[PDB]
Amino acid sequence: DADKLPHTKVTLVAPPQVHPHEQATKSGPKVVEFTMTIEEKKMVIDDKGTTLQAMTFNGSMPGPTLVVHEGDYVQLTLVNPATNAMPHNVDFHGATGALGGAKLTNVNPGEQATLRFKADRSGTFVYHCAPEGMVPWHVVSGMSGTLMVLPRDGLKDPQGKPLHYDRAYTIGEFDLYIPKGPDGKYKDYATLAESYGDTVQVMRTLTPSHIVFNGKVGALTGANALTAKVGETVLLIHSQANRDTRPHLIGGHGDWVWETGKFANPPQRDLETWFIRGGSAGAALYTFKQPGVYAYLNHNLIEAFELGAAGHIKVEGKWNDDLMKQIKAPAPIPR
Amino acid sequence: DADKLPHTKVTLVAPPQVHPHEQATKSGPKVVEFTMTIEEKKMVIDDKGTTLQAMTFNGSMPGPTLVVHEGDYVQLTLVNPATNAMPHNVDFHGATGALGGAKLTNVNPGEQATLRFKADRSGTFVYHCAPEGMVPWHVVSGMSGTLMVLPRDGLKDPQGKPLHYDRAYTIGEFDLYIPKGPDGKYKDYATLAESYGDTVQVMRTLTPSHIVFNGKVGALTGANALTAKVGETVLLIHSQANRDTRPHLIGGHGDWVWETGKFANPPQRDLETWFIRGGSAGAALYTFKQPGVYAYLNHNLIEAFELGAAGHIKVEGKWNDDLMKQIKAPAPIPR
Amino acid sequence: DADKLPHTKVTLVAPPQVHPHEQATKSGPKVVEFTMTIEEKKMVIDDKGTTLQAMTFNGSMPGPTLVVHEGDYVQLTLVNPATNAMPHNVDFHGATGALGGAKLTNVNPGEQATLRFKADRSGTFVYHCAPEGMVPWHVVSGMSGTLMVLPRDGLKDPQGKPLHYDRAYTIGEFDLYIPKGPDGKYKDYATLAESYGDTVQVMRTLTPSHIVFNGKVGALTGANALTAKVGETVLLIHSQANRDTRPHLIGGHGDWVWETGKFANPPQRDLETWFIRGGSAGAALYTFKQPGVYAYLNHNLIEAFELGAAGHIKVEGKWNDDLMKQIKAPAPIPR
Ligand SMILES: [Cu+2]
Ligand SMILES: [Cu+2]
Ligand SMILES: [Cu+2]
Ligand SMILES: [Cu+2]
Ligand SMILES: [Cu+2]
Ligand SMILES: [Cu+2]
Ligand SMILES: [Zn+2]
Ligand SMILES: [Zn+2]
Ligand SMILES: [Zn+2]
């Protein structure tokens, strides 16, 4: 019975960071309290100025990652401010009953609600908005994120040996469906409601205009690249609420991967490319061994390089000639 | 040697039901006898009256599910009545040799044949029609279904502990390719043969017009929803003979899932969304814990809500506030 | 330290063959030396004369398969002759650092280079070209292949029991994006550089014009079918550097399958259809039990039969009535 448990309050952080948390814990179960505020807004999603009439949890695509442990209760206050036009709700894949909580969290602008559910299964789980009759539109417009439910004793390998990460990053991948007018240029809409019909027509083609990490082409590149150093283990959380994707670290590997994202199952090792089913979150560990700029991308290379599904990780440290060496630099072919 | 085994006769039932059968059995091997009769017919596949020039095993999409045990022999009489226009056959993925039996079951209208093969591998396996030079057309037009080969000692978890189901439902998901005329409306064809050319042109786009469960948008909703009650374990058999899909129970989980559909492999637990490769059948167990109306759908949410790949399960029983509770109903945001 | 190891030289062979190699080996680690020469050329890819402005490793799609053992070093000399127009490089998914080696192998026409890396992970791994700003184009134009890194003690089943193959075949599957002019016919380009813009436009549609095994519709059919005999175990290596595929043997199975392609993970058994994620290579074993002509294909049946992703295996030996028997040949339905 959850009425008599300790309560705790978590402050969420913006992706690609994940809020402070423990992996293995000596703690017993708690009610962990979170709040999220819905924001509708127009967003620039590419380098040429294209806009999306977007919908977000907490002002970001994806929403923030929520972290608890197996046996905890998640208690979320979902706030829909009066500045928004549309009703919203939340469907937690990590939860049992009531369409993931969607039936109990229907909030119109100016309303809020509080849902509690038991996080009784370990793994990374999508959450997303799911208003009746509008579900795909809200999802593709940006309303998704990850709940990570860690085992109380932390992550385990297939033999039950301990695994860990030293830093965690959360990547949401969004297939977008931006309409075009008769001149072949992307449409710019003055309100969210006026983008709907044209967008639905593009959706039904099943061909995204853009496929982006974290809300924009280039979101995780340049000054916003992810960072690590040789000898550090990174956890890459990858959510796709609507459409399959195939993550790959160029120059690296998935050392241990839960591609279905559920930690009571053994992970696979040594992956070049893994698969995240649309409507799921998966999780990869990798310990860096070489310094340099890596690319983390969807390995449909059209979706990555043409449509936007690619980011960078900048890694500090010492080069290792045992793992890789340039034996002869590029040079003229011998006479 | 199968000539000296006991024979048994199974009466098939219409999807989404599965014929009566045992899971673990004290029985030794038998020749299990089935009959199916091909029916070509025009079918209404959406709410706006669109038709498909369809092709079926036994009058349904999908065909009925055939259930035997590992070590049994399947002995199928395939009947192609003279009222049909086209030749047909059957390729059982569960079988070894002769293109799954297709080479030995070529039946023209007014013909029949009887094939026997050993069901020596456990799992859910697609069967489908595969006439030379017409294979994709027959498949996408409706000619597929599932053979379920159960282990003689029933289903097992990764530690070899027993698993079971209390009721079984079979879901076939069909990507359809309905042509349109110059006015943008779907074409209605007076015969099956006259739909072919236009359909092939749509197929080669790889963009389905509709993606439906069990032959129609809404087939498994309203008065035709699947049913269960809290504490009952349901087995959901999901076949897709042509194109990938990503099943998800909204408000539930895949408790134990064989997404490649082969029961000699350990299942994965706690899945939010699983993957059925085109050309396969997979199987999920879930034990209900909350009452209510769940949605079972393809979690490409465009494919589900826009194109038709979604159904309902109506579950009886007592609500559980431990698993989920509305802490505060929707209400105005505080002054 | 690799400077003091034995060196060996491997002569590569054209797909679908794989060069001579051992499975389990008493050998310790070596530096294994390979050379590949890039060739740009125009290729006929279908039966109606359509051309592709192609790019290859060693004159074939896919490139040749390189085979080493876990703990070996791969030492590749990559040659870009002056007869080529474009710069090239190589990204080995099996390698760690420097974008898979791409950063250390940038070769302009008339240049070469030599890269060494440690093959420290077992599995089948894609390699492909990855020039800055042109990555998808080079890949879809043909520049990919497989590195197979075998465990030093050979392949193992989930219980650690030995597995083997008697012959190995390598299949590369290429999604192609051939543009069309205003008359609806495929364009023929006089040079590689003149195909680029039009091709990029087709790529961004995500709809391939053709999907072929080994460079052409029908490449692995007729006089070029793969061959085996009853009682022989075949290893089918399946690479797709850009786009998902779903291999299936019609009339057969995947006896043991590593669909993510990484041999330190247990294989799945009894598969009807497996999944190769775009940007990966996977591996299936099957021991033939029936003679005849099998089809090995992508089980999106449109992609197979309409677009080209299908081949044949011709199998010698004795028919087995226990596994399959025609009980009654096709005949009129009884009076
Ligand atoms: Cu919403
Ligand atoms: Cu969902
Ligand atoms: Cu047929
Ligand atoms: Cu098939
Ligand atoms: Cu290149
Ligand atoms: Cu790559
Ligand atoms: Zn307006
Ligand atoms: Zn007519
Ligand atoms: Zn010219």
PDB file of C-alpha atoms in Angstrom, chain A residues 16-220:
ATOM      1  CA  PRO A  16      19.936  15.383 -23.708  1.00  0.00           C
ATOM      2  CA  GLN A  17      20.788  15.330 -19.963  1.00  0.00           C
ATOM      3  CA  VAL A  18      19.042  13.071 -17.503  1.00  0.00           C
ATOM      4  CA  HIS A  19      18.328  14.198 -13.911  1.00  0.00           C
ATOM      5  CA  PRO A  20      20.587  13.023 -11.088  1.00  0.00           C
ATOM      6  CA  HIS A  21      19.807   9.524  -9.901  1.00  0.00           C
ATOM      7  CA  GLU A  22      21.263   6.391  -8.372  1.00  0.00           C
ATOM      8  CA  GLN A  23      21.660   3.076 -10.234  1.00  0.00           C
ATOM      9  CA  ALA A  24      21.848   0.328  -7.588  1.00  0.00           C
ATOM     10  CA  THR A  25      20.187   1.639  -4.414  1.00  0.00           C
ATOM     11  CA  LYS A  26      19.903   0.593  -0.783  1.00  0.00           C
ATOM     12  CA  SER A  27      16.584   2.557  -0.739  1.00  0.00           C
ATOM     13  CA  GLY A  28      13.180   0.849  -0.404  1.00  0.00           C
ATOM     14  CA  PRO A  29      10.218   1.942  -2.552  1.00  0.00           C
ATOM     15  CA  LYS A  30       8.952   5.527  -2.596  1.00  0.00           C
ATOM     16  CA  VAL A  31       6.331   7.666  -4.257  1.00  0.00           C
ATOM     17  CA  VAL A  32       8.478   9.788  -6.599  1.00  0.00           C
ATOM     18  CA  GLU A  33       6.777  13.112  -7.483  1.00  0.00           C
ATOM     19  CA  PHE A  34       7.225  14.909 -10.799  1.00  0.00           C
ATOM     20  CA  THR A  35       5.528  17.804 -12.549  1.00  0.00           C
ATOM     21  CA  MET A  36       5.377  18.569 -16.231  1.00  0.00           C
ATOM     22  CA  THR A  37       3.827  21.539 -18.004  1.00  0.00           C
ATOM     23  CA  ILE A  38       2.623  21.210 -21.586  1.00  0.00           C
ATOM     24  CA  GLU A  39       3.798  23.882 -24.034  1.00  0.00           C
ATOM     25  CA  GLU A  40       2.534  24.335 -27.590  1.00  0.00           C
ATOM     26  CA  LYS A  41       4.906  26.376 -29.710  1.00  0.00           C
ATOM     27  CA  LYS A  42       6.267  26.966 -33.133  1.00  0.00           C
ATOM     28  CA  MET A  43       9.764  25.609 -33.610  1.00  0.00           C
ATOM     29  CA  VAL A  44      12.450  25.991 -36.318  1.00  0.00           C
ATOM     30  CA  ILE A  45      13.491  22.397 -37.174  1.00  0.00           C
ATOM     31  CA  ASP A  46      16.058  22.775 -39.940  1.00  0.00           C
ATOM     32  CA  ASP A  47      18.895  25.053 -41.172  1.00  0.00           C
ATOM     33  CA  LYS A  48      16.716  26.661 -43.893  1.00  0.00           C
ATOM     34  CA  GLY A  49      14.110  28.045 -41.458  1.00  0.00           C
ATOM     35  CA  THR A  50      11.322  25.514 -41.787  1.00  0.00           C
ATOM     36  CA  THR A  51       8.872  25.638 -38.932  1.00  0.00           C
ATOM     37  CA  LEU A  52       6.882  23.068 -37.085  1.00  0.00           C
ATOM     38  CA  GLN A  53       3.695  23.774 -35.180  1.00  0.00           C
ATOM     39  CA  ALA A  54       4.846  21.773 -32.253  1.00  0.00           C
ATOM     40  CA  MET A  55       3.525  20.329 -29.036  1.00  0.00           C
ATOM     41  CA  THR A  56       5.838  19.519 -26.069  1.00  0.00           C
ATOM     42  CA  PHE A  57       6.117  18.230 -22.546  1.00  0.00           C
ATOM     43  CA  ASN A  58       8.132  20.858 -20.635  1.00  0.00           C
ATOM     44  CA  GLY A  59       9.162  22.902 -23.691  1.00  0.00           C
ATOM     45  CA  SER A  60      11.504  20.276 -25.269  1.00  0.00           C
ATOM     46  CA  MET A  61      11.407  17.460 -27.881  1.00  0.00           C
ATOM     47  CA  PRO A  62      11.656  14.907 -26.440  1.00  0.00           C
ATOM     48  CA  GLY A  63      10.052  15.567 -23.031  1.00  0.00           C
ATOM     49  CA  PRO A  64      12.443  15.118 -20.101  1.00  0.00           C
ATOM     50  CA  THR A  65      13.441  11.642 -18.981  1.00  0.00           C
ATOM     51  CA  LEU A  66      11.844  10.532 -15.639  1.00  0.00           C
ATOM     52  CA  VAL A  67      13.988   8.077 -13.605  1.00  0.00           C
ATOM     53  CA  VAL A  68      12.722   5.849 -10.810  1.00  0.00           C
ATOM     54  CA  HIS A  69      13.392   2.299  -9.539  1.00  0.00           C
ATOM     55  CA  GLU A  70      11.429  -0.866  -9.892  1.00  0.00           C
ATOM     56  CA  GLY A  71       8.766  -0.984  -7.032  1.00  0.00           C
ATOM     57  CA  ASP A  72       8.534   2.869  -6.808  1.00  0.00           C
ATOM     58  CA  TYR A  73       5.405   4.766  -7.635  1.00  0.00           C
ATOM     59  CA  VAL A  74       5.378   7.486 -10.174  1.00  0.00           C
ATOM     60  CA  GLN A  75       3.187  10.414  -9.213  1.00  0.00           C
ATOM     61  CA  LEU A  76       2.975  12.958 -12.030  1.00  0.00           C
ATOM     62  CA  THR A  77       1.195  16.325 -11.988  1.00  0.00           C
ATOM     63  CA  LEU A  78       0.397  17.163 -15.579  1.00  0.00           C
ATOM     64  CA  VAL A  79      -0.285  20.908 -16.135  1.00  0.00           C
ATOM     65  CA  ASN A  80      -1.970  22.264 -19.276  1.00  0.00           C
ATOM     66  CA  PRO A  81      -1.749  26.112 -19.115  1.00  0.00           C
ATOM     67  CA  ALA A  82      -4.484  28.361 -20.449  1.00  0.00           C
ATOM     68  CA  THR A  83      -2.045  29.773 -23.074  1.00  0.00           C
ATOM     69  CA  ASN A  84      -2.341  26.437 -24.909  1.00  0.00           C
ATOM     70  CA  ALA A  85      -5.087  25.757 -27.445  1.00  0.00           C
ATOM     71  CA  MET A  86      -5.575  21.981 -27.240  1.00  0.00           C
ATOM     72  CA  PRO A  87      -6.465  19.412 -24.602  1.00  0.00           C
ATOM     73  CA  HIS A  88      -3.750  16.873 -23.682  1.00  0.00           C
ATOM     74  CA  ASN A  89      -3.104  13.833 -21.500  1.00  0.00           C
ATOM     75  CA  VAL A  90      -0.376  11.197 -20.940  1.00  0.00           C
ATOM     76  CA  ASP A  91      -0.017   7.494 -21.714  1.00  0.00           C
ATOM     77  CA  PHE A  92       2.841   5.895 -19.868  1.00  0.00           C
ATOM     78  CA  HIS A  93       3.908   2.641 -21.452  1.00  0.00           C
ATOM     79  CA  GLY A  94       5.512   1.778 -18.085  1.00  0.00           C
ATOM     80  CA  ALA A  95       2.047   1.807 -16.415  1.00  0.00           C
ATOM     81  CA  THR A  96      -0.819  -0.702 -16.119  1.00  0.00           C
ATOM     82  CA  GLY A  97      -4.471   0.299 -16.776  1.00  0.00           C
ATOM     83  CA  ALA A  98      -6.611   3.153 -18.180  1.00  0.00           C
ATOM     84  CA  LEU A  99      -4.796   3.393 -21.573  1.00  0.00           C
ATOM     85  CA  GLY A 100      -1.539   4.043 -19.730  1.00  0.00           C
ATOM     86  CA  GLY A 101      -3.138   6.807 -17.615  1.00  0.00           C
ATOM     87  CA  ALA A 102      -4.514   8.712 -20.627  1.00  0.00           C
ATOM     88  CA  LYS A 103      -8.122   8.153 -19.459  1.00  0.00           C
ATOM     89  CA  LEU A 104      -7.318   9.756 -16.055  1.00  0.00           C
ATOM     90  CA  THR A 105      -5.261  12.736 -17.229  1.00  0.00           C
ATOM     91  CA  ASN A 106      -7.460  14.496 -19.801  1.00  0.00           C
ATOM     92  CA  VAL A 107      -6.622  18.168 -19.186  1.00  0.00           C
ATOM     93  CA  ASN A 108      -8.075  21.157 -21.134  1.00  0.00           C
ATOM     94  CA  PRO A 109      -6.193  24.425 -21.235  1.00  0.00           C
ATOM     95  CA  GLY A 110      -6.275  25.919 -17.684  1.00  0.00           C
ATOM     96  CA  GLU A 111      -6.445  22.448 -16.072  1.00  0.00           C
ATOM     97  CA  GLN A 112      -4.213  19.968 -14.304  1.00  0.00           C
ATOM     98  CA  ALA A 113      -4.260  16.506 -12.882  1.00  0.00           C
ATOM     99  CA  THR A 114      -2.198  14.080 -10.845  1.00  0.00           C
ATOM    100  CA  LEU A 115      -1.755  10.439 -11.728  1.00  0.00           C
ATOM    101  CA  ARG A 116      -0.081   7.723  -9.709  1.00  0.00           C
ATOM    102  CA  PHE A 117       0.994   4.316 -10.962  1.00  0.00           C
ATOM    103  CA  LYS A 118       3.305   1.583  -9.780  1.00  0.00           C
ATOM    104  CA  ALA A 119       6.544   1.273 -11.781  1.00  0.00           C
ATOM    105  CA  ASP A 120       6.594  -2.547 -11.393  1.00  0.00           C
ATOM    106  CA  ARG A 121       8.630  -3.351 -14.563  1.00  0.00           C
ATOM    107  CA  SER A 122      12.273  -2.406 -15.242  1.00  0.00           C
ATOM    108  CA  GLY A 123      13.282  -0.764 -18.574  1.00  0.00           C
ATOM    109  CA  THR A 124      13.102   2.390 -20.640  1.00  0.00           C
ATOM    110  CA  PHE A 125       9.393   3.093 -21.598  1.00  0.00           C
ATOM    111  CA  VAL A 126       7.888   5.704 -23.878  1.00  0.00           C
ATOM    112  CA  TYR A 127       5.367   8.107 -22.546  1.00  0.00           C
ATOM    113  CA  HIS A 128       3.298  10.188 -24.931  1.00  0.00           C
ATOM    114  CA  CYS A 129       0.166  12.281 -25.328  1.00  0.00           C
ATOM    115  CA  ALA A 130      -2.883  10.431 -26.599  1.00  0.00           C
ATOM    116  CA  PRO A 131      -6.009  12.620 -26.840  1.00  0.00           C
ATOM    117  CA  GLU A 132      -9.062  10.803 -28.295  1.00  0.00           C
ATOM    118  CA  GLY A 133      -9.312  11.259 -32.067  1.00  0.00           C
ATOM    119  CA  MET A 134      -5.964  13.181 -32.307  1.00  0.00           C
ATOM    120  CA  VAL A 135      -3.361  10.626 -31.135  1.00  0.00           C
ATOM    121  CA  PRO A 136      -0.876  10.512 -34.098  1.00  0.00           C
ATOM    122  CA  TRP A 137      -0.879  14.249 -34.614  1.00  0.00           C
ATOM    123  CA  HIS A 138       0.063  15.026 -30.984  1.00  0.00           C
ATOM    124  CA  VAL A 139       2.776  12.358 -31.005  1.00  0.00           C
ATOM    125  CA  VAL A 140       4.426  13.387 -34.283  1.00  0.00           C
ATOM    126  CA  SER A 141       4.174  17.064 -33.259  1.00  0.00           C
ATOM    127  CA  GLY A 142       6.520  16.344 -30.302  1.00  0.00           C
ATOM    128  CA  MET A 143       4.642  14.982 -27.313  1.00  0.00           C
ATOM    129  CA  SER A 144       6.793  12.030 -26.206  1.00  0.00           C
ATOM    130  CA  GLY A 145       9.647  11.146 -23.899  1.00  0.00           C
ATOM    131  CA  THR A 146      11.105   8.320 -21.748  1.00  0.00           C
ATOM    132  CA  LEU A 147      10.389   6.852 -18.246  1.00  0.00           C
ATOM    133  CA  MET A 148      13.407   4.829 -17.148  1.00  0.00           C
ATOM    134  CA  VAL A 149      12.660   2.283 -14.432  1.00  0.00           C
ATOM    135  CA  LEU A 150      15.995   0.926 -13.118  1.00  0.00           C
ATOM    136  CA  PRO A 151      16.295  -2.413 -11.305  1.00  0.00           C
ATOM    137  CA  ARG A 152      16.765  -1.732  -7.559  1.00  0.00           C
ATOM    138  CA  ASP A 153      20.165  -3.576  -7.765  1.00  0.00           C
ATOM    139  CA  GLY A 154      21.140  -1.722 -11.023  1.00  0.00           C
ATOM    140  CA  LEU A 155      21.811  -3.149 -14.496  1.00  0.00           C
ATOM    141  CA  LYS A 156      22.967  -6.720 -15.093  1.00  0.00           C
ATOM    142  CA  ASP A 157      24.729  -8.599 -17.892  1.00  0.00           C
ATOM    143  CA  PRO A 158      23.501 -12.008 -19.233  1.00  0.00           C
ATOM    144  CA  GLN A 159      25.397 -13.818 -16.445  1.00  0.00           C
ATOM    145  CA  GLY A 160      24.021 -11.476 -13.824  1.00  0.00           C
ATOM    146  CA  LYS A 161      27.281  -9.553 -13.440  1.00  0.00           C
ATOM    147  CA  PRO A 162      26.940  -5.843 -12.601  1.00  0.00           C
ATOM    148  CA  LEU A 163      26.840  -3.198 -15.333  1.00  0.00           C
ATOM    149  CA  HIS A 164      26.912   0.565 -14.961  1.00  0.00           C
ATOM    150  CA  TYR A 165      27.067   3.837 -16.690  1.00  0.00           C
ATOM    151  CA  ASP A 166      29.002   6.967 -15.708  1.00  0.00           C
ATOM    152  CA  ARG A 167      26.849   9.387 -17.658  1.00  0.00           C
ATOM    153  CA  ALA A 168      23.433   9.125 -19.373  1.00  0.00           C
ATOM    154  CA  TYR A 169      22.101  10.906 -22.406  1.00  0.00           C
ATOM    155  CA  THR A 170      18.553  10.817 -23.748  1.00  0.00           C
ATOM    156  CA  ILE A 171      17.890  10.993 -27.541  1.00  0.00           C
ATOM    157  CA  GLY A 172      14.318  11.326 -28.923  1.00  0.00           C
ATOM    158  CA  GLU A 173      13.921  10.767 -32.661  1.00  0.00           C
ATOM    159  CA  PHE A 174      10.984  12.484 -34.365  1.00  0.00           C
ATOM    160  CA  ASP A 175       9.623  11.721 -37.753  1.00  0.00           C
ATOM    161  CA  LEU A 176       8.046  14.976 -38.929  1.00  0.00           C
ATOM    162  CA  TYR A 177       5.449  15.549 -41.623  1.00  0.00           C
ATOM    163  CA  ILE A 178       5.668  19.203 -42.758  1.00  0.00           C
ATOM    164  CA  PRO A 179       3.325  20.152 -45.569  1.00  0.00           C
ATOM    165  CA  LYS A 180       4.282  21.965 -48.733  1.00  0.00           C
ATOM    166  CA  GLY A 181       2.294  24.479 -50.847  1.00  0.00           C
ATOM    167  CA  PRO A 182       1.954  24.555 -54.678  1.00  0.00           C
ATOM    168  CA  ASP A 183       5.382  26.274 -55.011  1.00  0.00           C
ATOM    169  CA  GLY A 184       7.157  23.270 -53.357  1.00  0.00           C
ATOM    170  CA  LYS A 185       8.183  25.285 -50.256  1.00  0.00           C
ATOM    171  CA  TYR A 186       7.246  24.216 -46.680  1.00  0.00           C
ATOM    172  CA  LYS A 187       4.156  25.899 -45.239  1.00  0.00           C
ATOM    173  CA  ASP A 188       4.375  28.251 -42.274  1.00  0.00           C
ATOM    174  CA  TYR A 189       1.213  28.226 -40.093  1.00  0.00           C
ATOM    175  CA  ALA A 190       0.117  31.068 -37.882  1.00  0.00           C
ATOM    176  CA  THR A 191      -1.586  28.766 -35.370  1.00  0.00           C
ATOM    177  CA  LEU A 192      -1.356  25.089 -34.368  1.00  0.00           C
ATOM    178  CA  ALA A 193      -4.965  24.335 -35.398  1.00  0.00           C
ATOM    179  CA  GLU A 194      -4.401  25.592 -38.955  1.00  0.00           C
ATOM    180  CA  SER A 195      -1.494  23.115 -39.537  1.00  0.00           C
ATOM    181  CA  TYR A 196      -3.676  20.060 -38.823  1.00  0.00           C
ATOM    182  CA  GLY A 197      -5.424  19.143 -42.028  1.00  0.00           C
ATOM    183  CA  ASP A 198      -2.476  19.600 -44.346  1.00  0.00           C
ATOM    184  CA  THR A 199      -0.283  17.630 -41.845  1.00  0.00           C
ATOM    185  CA  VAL A 200      -2.674  14.697 -41.686  1.00  0.00           C
ATOM    186  CA  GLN A 201      -2.477  14.473 -45.496  1.00  0.00           C
ATOM    187  CA  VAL A 202       1.362  14.251 -45.318  1.00  0.00           C
ATOM    188  CA  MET A 203       1.183  11.699 -42.440  1.00  0.00           C
ATOM    189  CA  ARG A 204      -0.957   9.348 -44.437  1.00  0.00           C
ATOM    190  CA  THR A 205       1.846   9.187 -47.081  1.00  0.00           C
ATOM    191  CA  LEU A 206       4.048   7.574 -44.418  1.00  0.00           C
ATOM    192  CA  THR A 207       6.993   9.649 -45.778  1.00  0.00           C
ATOM    193  CA  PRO A 208       8.502  12.066 -43.272  1.00  0.00           C
ATOM    194  CA  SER A 209       9.803  15.411 -44.512  1.00  0.00           C
ATOM    195  CA  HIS A 210      12.422  15.447 -41.756  1.00  0.00           C
ATOM    196  CA  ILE A 211      13.603  12.992 -39.190  1.00  0.00           C
ATOM    197  CA  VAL A 212      15.368  14.767 -36.325  1.00  0.00           C
ATOM    198  CA  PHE A 213      17.013  14.098 -33.042  1.00  0.00           C
ATOM    199  CA  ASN A 214      15.869  16.296 -30.141  1.00  0.00           C
ATOM    200  CA  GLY A 215      13.724  18.681 -32.177  1.00  0.00           C
ATOM    201  CA  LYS A 216      15.955  19.917 -34.954  1.00  0.00           C
ATOM    202  CA  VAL A 217      18.471  19.043 -37.664  1.00  0.00           C
ATOM    203  CA  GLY A 218      21.861  19.397 -35.949  1.00  0.00           C
ATOM    204  CA  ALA A 219      20.452  19.576 -32.394  1.00  0.00           C
ATOM    205  CA  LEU A 220      23.271  17.303 -31.125  1.00  0.00           C
TER     206      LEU A 220
END
